[PDB]
Structures are given as C-alpha cells and as structure tokens.
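Hi W.,

Here's what went into the run:
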Amino acid sequence: VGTRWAVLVAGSNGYENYRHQADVCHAYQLLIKGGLKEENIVVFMYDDIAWHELNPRPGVIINNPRGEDVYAGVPKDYTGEDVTAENLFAVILGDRSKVKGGSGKVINSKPEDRIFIFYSNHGAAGVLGMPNEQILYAMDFIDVLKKKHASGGYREMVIYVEACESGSLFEGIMPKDLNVFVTTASNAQENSWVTYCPGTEPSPPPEYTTCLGDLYSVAWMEDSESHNLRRETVNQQYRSVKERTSNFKDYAMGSHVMQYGDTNITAEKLYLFQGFDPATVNPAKMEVVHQRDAELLFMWQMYQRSNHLKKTHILKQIAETVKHRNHLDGSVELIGVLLYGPGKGSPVLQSVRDPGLPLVDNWACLKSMVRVFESHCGSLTQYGMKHMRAFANICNSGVSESSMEEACMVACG
Amino acid sequence: VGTRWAVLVAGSNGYENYRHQADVCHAYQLLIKGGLKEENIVVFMYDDIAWHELNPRPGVIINNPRGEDVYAGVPKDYTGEDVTAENLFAVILGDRSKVKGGSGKVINSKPEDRIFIFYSNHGAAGVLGMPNEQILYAMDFIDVLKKKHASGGYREMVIYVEACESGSLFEGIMPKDLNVFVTTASNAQENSWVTYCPGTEPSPPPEYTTCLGDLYSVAWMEDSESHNLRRETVNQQYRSVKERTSNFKDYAMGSHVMQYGDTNITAEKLYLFQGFDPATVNPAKMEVVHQRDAELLFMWQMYQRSNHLKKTHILKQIAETVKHRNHLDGSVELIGVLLYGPGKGSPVLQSVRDPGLPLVDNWACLKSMVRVFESHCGSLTQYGMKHMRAFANICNSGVSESSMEEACMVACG
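Here's what came out:
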C-alpha cells in the first residue's frame, strides 16, 4: 500500500542516561531489519554516549546483556544542540523550512503512509524531557498531531512513550478521530522503570557502571524481534508489554501500560508500522530501578570502583546532586505552604485527578508557573520536572500569577 | 500510709507550645484539689506563657474551651534558665546539693511514699525535649529511676509521658522490679496529637491563635476530675485514656497508649498517687493536629489575622522555619546516601525494630552521633529531634564515628 516512516527520540543526555539512547539505536536496528528505509526514519539522539570517556566499549552501545552493538549505522539526523522540541515538531509536520540544523530529514509523508513514533527518557505529569535544558508540554505535542492530521500527512499512526507519568500526556486531551493509537509505559501518576542495571539480575557485562535499558522499551523491542510481525497484532504487543512492564503484577516495582486514541488500530498487524524480518518464522520477576534514581545508582558505582587520586571528588558530586534536588523539593513544598497554608499545601500540590481527566485546565498557565519558579528558584532539571503536577494543581486551585510571584520571591529570593 | 509527691515537666518554650505548660498548670491544680501539698509537688515550666505579648488573657492560662484559669497559684520551682535535664534528675533523686538555681524544692521522699510524674511536650525515638536547647536521653532517665529505687526513695511510682514516640523511651530498657508503672501517649514509632486548636471542634475561645492541650494529657486530667479516684483504678484510667487517644480507633489521627514496668500497680486506686477531691461523688471523633505541625498552624493564624504595617514579616518567618526543617531533613537523607548509598540509605535510616527491642544498643554512641551532626549541620531543634531513630540506626549498622565525621563534613561543611 504505502510507506512506513519513523521518528525515534531520546530526550536526555549524559552517561547516566545511557539507556535512552541505547533503546533508540536498537529500535533503529529493529526497523531497518524489518525493511524500513534510512531516509524514512528520523533519529534524535544527543550523540554523547558511544565515544564518552566512561564507555568501556568505544564506539559501541548495547541494550541487553547479550552485548550486540546497536550503534553502528544509526544516522546522525538531529544530535547535540539540534535535539529540540522545535525540531521534533518540524520533523513530524514534514517541513524542512522550519528545521534548525541537522540532516534536514523530515516526515514528508503521503496520505496512504503509516508512522511509528518512539520516545524514550525523562518525564513527569504533562511533560517530556529534551536534552538542551528543555521541557516538551503535552498539549503542544497533541497540537502537532492535530495539524498533521488536518493536512493529510498519514493513514495511521502508532506512538510508544517511555517516560514517568506518560499517561498524563494523553489522558483527557487525546482525540480518537486522529487515526493515532498510543501506548505509554506508565499511568498518569506513576513512574517508569529501568532494567539491566549494575548489581541486578539479569546482570549486564561487569565493566558497565550505568544501566542499559528501560522495562517498557525493551519489552516491545525484544517482543517484536522474537515474533513474525505479519502474524502479531498491535494489541498482542500491548498485552505482552503490559504483562512484562507490570512485573508479575507487583506495581511497587512495576507500572501500568496504558492505551489512548483510535483503538481499532490494535486489530492491524504490527508489520504495517514496524515491518517484518523475513528470517523470523518463530512466532521470573526482574530487578528494576526507578527512572529518577538511576543517576545516583550510576554515580555510586563510580564511587565504589575508584581509588584516591578522585574517589572523594565523586562523593562531593553525589552530595551536590542530592542537595540540588532537595532544594527543588523543599521549595515546591514551601510554596504550597505560603499559598495554601501548612496542612493544606501538600494535599493541594499532591492531589491526583481521576483518570480520563486532563492534568491542567490551562496549559499556557502551566508554562507560566514553571517560568515564575525558574526565575527565582533557578532552573528545573529533568528531576525537577516531577513537580509538574504541583504546578498544574496551582493553576486549577485558581491562584494568580502574582500570588505565585510573591510565593517564589519569599521561598527563594 | 505515706506522702504523695509529684514532678510535673513541660520540656518546651515559646507561645507556639502554649499547651505543654497549660497541661502542667492544670495537673498542678488537679493534684492540689486532691489533697496533695505544694511542698511535695515540683513544677518545671519555662514561665513564658502567662505574660507573653501574644496572650489575650494576661496572667491567665487555660487548658480546655471552658476557660478556667489554671495558672493562679502554680509555684515557680524551676523556670527559664533552670528547666534543665540536670535539675530534673536532681529533683527526682532528692538532693538539694546537686540543684542549680530555682526554689530548691526536691523529691526527698521516704520509703513508704508514692510518686507521680507527668512530662508534657516534644520528643522523638529515645529522646525528650528540654527548653534551653537540650535533649533528654531515655537511658539517662532510666538510670535515675534505678538510682532512686536503689536508695529506697519510694514505694510505688506512676509516670505519664506526653510526647511523640514516647514508647521508645521504655521499650527494651525499662525494668519491672523498680515498682514503677509508666503509660505513654504513643508507641515507639508514632507521633502524639494536639487538641483544642484554632479552627477545630471543640473550638477554643476565638481570641486564641495557639492550641491549648494534648490528646493524651487532657484525656487523663479530664477523666480523673470527672470521677471519684477512691473507686477508680490506675488500669481504668489507662483504658479510658487509650480509648480517647486512639480517636475512635483511627490511628491516622490517633495514637496507641502504651504501658511499661510493674503492671501490678494497675490494681491500685488512682487516689494513692493523684489523691481525691472530696466533692466528687460522680463516678464524637475529635479534630486533632500533629505535635510537630502545631507551630506552623499557630504562625499561619498570626499571618491570617494581621494587617500590613507586618503580615509580610510573619510570612518571611514561616519561610525561615520551613527552610530550616528542610535543611535538617535533607542533611539526614544525604548522610544516609553518603554512608549506605542511594536506595539503601533510606531503608537503613527509617527501619523500625520490633516492639520490646531497645532503640539503640549503645546509648553513648547515640549522643556522639547528635554531637557530630550538630558540629557540622548546626543545632538540632525540637523538630530536628525526629531523626533520632536514623542516628540510632547509624549506631546499630556498625558505622564508625570517623565515617560519621566524613559524612557530616561532605553533607554540610
């Protein structure tokens, strides 16, 4: 019938977030093996993992303990300075005139074409991470899908989102008339999980200090590559993914894989979006780590493997990271006290709306709350994104931008 | 038979802790009404509540919404600078030569005498608060009881402790051969509750900004004064207190009243320790607040009743209190990370030993952990006491004082 396009994104940088770029390279390898074309697949990756000083396999990136290189041949479409939300939206809309840097490869698709999107890092309620100190907002991503559908750019779309609280990105704001089906790693109020970590089973190669993959991401990729996709349906991937990501239904070390959008697309066979490898005829509870805590796990492995020349330097960096996230956590807490009073501030900032309801009523107000906070308390990092439900709850409580300016002023200025 | 002695203590100062000194004055009024004598009753109270600028009833202190003055005639035994743990132990042992300041009134009791002790503020695991920036340790209090028993200073003793985690003060370290019976407001890992707060039911007089009493304290006093104590047993007080302090068995806004020591004393009638009022022939779920959070509740009432001349001054003080306790909380958290690693530090610092087991194996090591922490992170306040279980767990994990010095150095120096 048509052409199969793909956009693969890792919204994080640094060796502590090695897994997000590893998932992306593997996904690129998977799609090429299934007969998709390089020109039709756009890769967003900062490109700071394969040649990083801390890499024990120079120019090699792996996603599972089997140690296959997934880096070779991955195209440098949008790297470093180029991994922006502006370029992401430009690549999805298919306009080269709106792109800033990179290869220039965009999704200029015809109406009969199918698109597969995969995002890996990261996130928090209503937001996704971008490497160059950026926050991608849920409503903005939805707006691009609405604009792409309104110009006749595709027939069907399947999106896979790997990030904490990825369900808030679609709950209450995703239409079903866009011919887009979406699955997320977690529900609107949960965190995602990391796999193949140093000191866990299945154990990655001993020379590694950072984790290699993410529970939801590796579930779908290792599933598609162990099955004939001409037989396997989109629904059957979701059921196997949901089961693996749940971790034997232990949601204390698992997450709920959710589905949003046009559900009729689950009858379609996975090969219409992922292709098929003509070679494939062939049709226990894991030890996982929190997404926001894998950075400290990696840093602690660096500390426990080093000597004194230098080991006290790593320990000071561990303290600076912990103090920094304790400043973000404490400032949000205080702002809630200064705005709602003690005993009312926490129940307001940490309240969770029922499923099917959008995170925030005004998305532009969510962007101003972050703007006001960063102006007094300094930059929110990827960890700092976690208070996006508290910022949204500030909007829904009716509290003004001047009351937020006065609170951030008393909390940090 | 003999004489009934009493020691009444409030280990806190400031108008935010009005209730602890109010409980003490009422208890003094109760005991005098029951025929005990001024000379035999020692009162420890900082004495900064009745004439405080914020008091809407100058020279008057109340404990219930009925508004009876409990301040009149309460003796100034040990006030201000004199409310120390050193004087507390000296008063209990009955030696005037070891007292520093005050009235000089001590418990010089004969072997046939009975003693009733009441402590009101807050506390934490193994510790009690004292006003002049002091921490009373559980083992030290037990040591005085052992020394007093070994010299034949009494026949029976009944102690009532009102403070968070008051059960840790006796669990695993209280002997039963001392002829001492003890009840506590909470178990070893729970917090105590405050009653008669502004904005709750039963509502105190509108002119009040701070709470008037504590759930456990008011339960026993209002119970003894509504019954003939010549009939009422010690066990029957504990059962009525336990029921009231449990708050309709809702332990999310209640606590477990515990019992320790010689249990045969529960058969004895309450009048042998509390006396009897010859006049007394006569034989819903409350809205309560956490002990560590009533200071902020009081400050928020000050903020919501004031105007601009001054209301922004109160708000800045609220922020400084919140930042200060966020520094204490964040430093303890980090010390656990620097000592046990991320993901292992919190489960180590917040682990709870099973009932009947002492909080810490080495009590002198608990005092050095606090000493090392305060030397780098600054003074622990009454709120800051809350990390005493984490300091004790540091001792029980086997970690050295030099490792604690290196951790507090990286966390705060």
